[PDB]
């Protein structure tokens, strides 16, 4: 039986109180697609992220439904709208059993709070110690002092930092000055230190601290480039597009000797598990940036193994078809 | 002096009689941009190709002029229309002296006609013997017999072939059957043998004859993929987009162990010389597919070294600004 059918689900997941993204997030709104052909089915998540995605939830819903209406009649071109392309391409890959299963469902811990308490937490980590910490909220001196404390405390810690383009050149300098140069190599990367990319490149070259691009990847005219100081790229599939485009970006990063990190756009557990599979497959030696499930009050449909959050089943979701 | 100025030229170059592309081409219509900032200038060619480019000459002219009007005020986003993106990005690269100069202005000879006469010509070739021959005009038996004759005649010849998606699986088989399996390795690649890409992939896997993608690269949803039988990709910048996108595609091809060939879209001598520079830079060990200048009755502005065609100078071209 080659018979095609499909369902599209619309949903809202309550966020934990206080989730910040410069702006608060109360609810995660999104969509699932389920595609079926004969005995097989595949799922994907279409959840554009407010303030990051160009498209809204409602625009994505429209494009998704139109795409599904075509697919039901036979193969068609992928959507270009990135959230929809991501979710549909994932569902297609599951249908054909070409998105691999994974042993490991990994995430770099996203950490905040009292520095000493974090030291205690990170020292008890098994395996390679990688954690992600936001910078650029406090002043630069405080950030540099705290990073230095963490790195001095745990000799095998490697920190990913993210300034979300907060800094001027001077603030980047004030930060770096407080990080012991003998530890700077264990900043695995600092995402988007400065307001402009040229200022970020100068920060990297001048301080020796490795940077990564994140927001930059979605800007018009971005190109993958090997350049002194850039050590990594952060690929957020929901903001990027198809699974194949994601794969092309990982490949581009690796060809240039750059680390490619698969990272969360605050997807539901369904999309997060798929990101975990993408990471285990395409970036097997890079822990992905997926530690956002614990910002949410529930899982849906597909479980992240080990999570104790309650699970909303398919039958409780709103159906559009 | 950081003062910006620009000129846009519109032109028509008469083609030699009988140039075929399933359809005749009388004239090559196109555009140049010249960008100047202080003491520096850069040039590029914007010449969409009828039947291949989505955009027309006139649509490209519009987009180019609008882009130039922005650039004159300061840096802006590149055009997305591929011919315009190519030409503008080339001009920008020249402005900053980031499109390298080249020693060699190379092209794989594009050959036709009596097989024996071609044998004589190719035997007198200095250096590595690579030539390109069209297939799929004659019947498949004739094509296979002639390819076999050429390869048997010249032991160090490597042929690039192009069927322009002419064949069914059966025609591909009729062709292959007449090529001695001991010589098939010296078909460097056969571009687009079959009407569908799946049929082309099966041709490659089943006959052992390497294929290349050309037209496929510009189709929606193309992805760069290592797969048995695909050995090369043909990148035509005018049909592709920016110099940076071209560079990304070469990089993608090389990461996958594929040959990347920079190829002509029947540009004027100006654009062809730039393609030659792109090839010497990005694909230093791959002779580019640039042997189309001798289809044209004149060069303009920039000379291909060694050509005896007359040169139309800048002062004879129509100016739009
Ligand atoms: O990359 C990760 O480790 C987790 C995801 C993450 O840090 C982010 C997800 C979405 C928006 C941003 O707040 C933030 C980032 O800039 O990387
Ligand atoms: O690639 C080359 O060697 C020369 C250019 C070439 O063969 C082509 C240019 C433009 C259209 C096509 O006729 C043809 C091709 O399909 O590669
Ligand atoms: Mg980031
Ligand atoms: Mg071709």
Curated annotation (Swiss-Prot), chains A, B:
It holds the Pfam family MR_MLE_C. It comes from the Bacteria. GO terms for molecular function: hydro-lyase activity; magnesium ion binding; O-succinylbenzoate synthase activity. The active site is at 134 (proton donor), 236 (proton acceptor). One of its GO terms (biological process) is menaquinone biosynthetic process. InterPro entries: Enolase-like_C_sf (IPR036849), Enolase-like_N (IPR029017), Enolase_C-like (IPR029065), Mandelate_racemase_C (IPR013342), OSB_synthase_MenC1 (IPR010196), OSBS_N (IPR041338). Its EC number is 4.2.1.113. It catalyses: (1R,6R)-6-hydroxy-2-succinyl-cyclohexa-2,4-diene-1-carboxylate = 2-succinylbenzoate + H2O. Pathway: Quinol/quinone metabolism; 1,4-dihydroxy-2-naphthoate biosynthesis; 1,4-dihydroxy-2-naphthoate from chorismate: step 4/7; Quinol/quinone metabolism; menaquinone biosynthesis. Keywords: Lyase, Magnesium, Menaquinone biosynthesis, Metal-binding. SMART domains: MR_MLE. Mg(2+) binds at residues 162, 191, 214. It is an enzyme of class 4 (lyase). Its cofactor is Mg(2+). NCBIfam families: menC_gam_Gplu (TIGR01927), PRK05105.1 (NF003473). Belongs to the mandelate racemase/muconate lactonizing enzyme family. MenC type 1 subfamily. Converts 2-succinyl-6-hydroxy-2,4-cyclohexadiene-1-carboxylate (SHCHC) to 2-succinylbenzoate (OSB). Does not show detectable N-acylamino acid racemase (NAAAR) activity with N-acetyl-S-methionine as substrate. This is o-succinylbenzoate synthase. It comes from Escherichia coli (strain K12).
């Amino acid at each position: 039986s080659h018979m095609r059918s499909a369902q599209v689900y619309r949903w809202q997941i309550p966020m934990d109180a206080g989730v910040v993204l410069d702006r608060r997030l109360k609810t995660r709104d999104g969509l699932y697609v389920c595609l079926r052909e004969g005995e097989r089915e595949g799922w994907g998540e279409i959840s554009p992220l407010p303030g990051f995605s160009q498209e809204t939830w409602e625009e994505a819903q429209s494009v998704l439904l139109a795409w599904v209406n075509n697919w039901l009649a036979g193969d068609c071109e992928l959507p270009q709208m990135p959230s929809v392309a991501f979710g549909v391409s994932c569902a297609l890959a599951e249908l054909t059993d070409t998105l691999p299963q994974a042993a490991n469902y990994r995430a770099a811990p996203l950490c905040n709070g009292d520095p000493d308490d974090l030291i205690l937490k990170l020292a008890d980590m098994p395996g390679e110690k990688v954690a992600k910490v936001r910078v650029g909220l406090y002043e630069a001196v405080r950030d540099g002092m705290v990073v230095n404390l963490l790195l001095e405390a745990i000799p095998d810690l490697h920190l990913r930092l993210d300034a979300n383009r907060a800094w001027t050149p001077l603030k980047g300098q004030q930060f770096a000055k407080y990080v012991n140069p003998d530890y700077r190599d264990r900043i695995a990367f600092l995402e988007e230190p400065c307001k402009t990319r040229d200022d970020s490149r100068a920060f990297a070259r001048e301080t020796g601290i490795a940077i990564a691009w994140d927001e930059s990847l979605r800007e018009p005219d971005f190109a993958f480039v090997a350049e002194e100081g850039v050590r990594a790229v952060v690929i957020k599939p929901t903001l990027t597009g198809s699974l194949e485009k994601v794969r092309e970006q990982v490949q581009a990063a690796h060809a240039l000797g750059l680390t490619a990190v698969i990272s969360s756009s605050i997807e539901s557990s369904l999309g997060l598990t798929q990101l975990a599979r993408i990471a285990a497959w395409l970036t097997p030696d890079t822990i992905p940036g997926l530690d956002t499930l614990d910002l949410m009050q529930a899982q849906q449909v597909r479980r992240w193994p080990g999570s104790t959050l309650p699970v909303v089943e398919v039958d409780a979701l709103e159906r559009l078809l």
